[PDB]
Amino acid sequence: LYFQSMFRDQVGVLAGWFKGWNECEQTVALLSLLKRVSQTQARFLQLCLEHSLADCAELHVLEREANSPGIINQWQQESKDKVISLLLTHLPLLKPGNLDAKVEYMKLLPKILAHSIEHNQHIEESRQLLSYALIHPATSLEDRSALAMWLNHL
Amino acid sequence: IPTTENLYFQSMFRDQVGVLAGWFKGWNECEQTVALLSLLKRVSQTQARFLQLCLEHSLADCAELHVLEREANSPGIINQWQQESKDKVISLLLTHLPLLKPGNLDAKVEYMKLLPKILAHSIEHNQHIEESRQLLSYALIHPATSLEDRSALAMWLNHLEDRTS
């Protein structure tokens, strides 16, 4: 592709910043740009992502787990470290219209945050979980109010 | 909002996102799409799926978009566009090619027939050069195009750049 030299330089700066960001930062920055594109650009990028992920078998296994309210509910029987691991790897795969699964994620979070905010442990994981919950289209305004108060307490 | 415990890092992240927003607002739609693709290729499968779900949610009930998508994936409709004025064909291709579904082979064949016709006219008459470059760029990054398609599209792009330089 033939591009303006300034644009090439800016994309180079972008790549450097992106490599230095954590995954939460990367996701948030990308969302900050995807909110500004046209519906047609958004659909094109959606098609690109769908094409790239179409035959990702391991991803599909995680997605099914992430959308199974019974599976999610059972995670309360795991150690704190494992539940935080499960939430971080599965919450981004929750489908926006899966209300029953969403409810099970919202039931597990306040238990994990209390322990973390008390034993000053996994606070970053807790912060990454609250960030992902706050930007997840599945969460309601009432969910997001609760999520915000849990951030204030943290 | 909170992405780091480090207060210095949190403030610098916000600064960077601001600069990014300013750059993005000044980019044309082709630059924006290419810049976004240059980041999406770097994310994990899980990040990619999350962003995909967000896009799908935002677009789910976009009625006017859906009308354009149906046109963009109808080979008979696309084929008829060759009867339109060169200005209209350029406009139709710009607005519909990004909506072509990656496995719609028959629709893709019709785009690959129309693109050389509008590029030959643009090169001969020194018109629509920017739009032609954008159409070729979109086609070259389009998940629907094959490696053979992209060899042909690169041929056309080099010819356009050679004839306009």
From Swiss-Prot, chain A:
UniProt-annotated location(s): Cytoplasm; Cell projection, Dendrite; Synapse, Synaptosome
Signal peptide: none
Job description of the protein: Acts as a translational repressor of SRE-containing messengers.
Family, similarity comment: Belongs to the SMAUG family.
Protein name (Swiss-Prot/TrEMBL): Protein Smaug homolog 1
Originating species: Homo sapiens
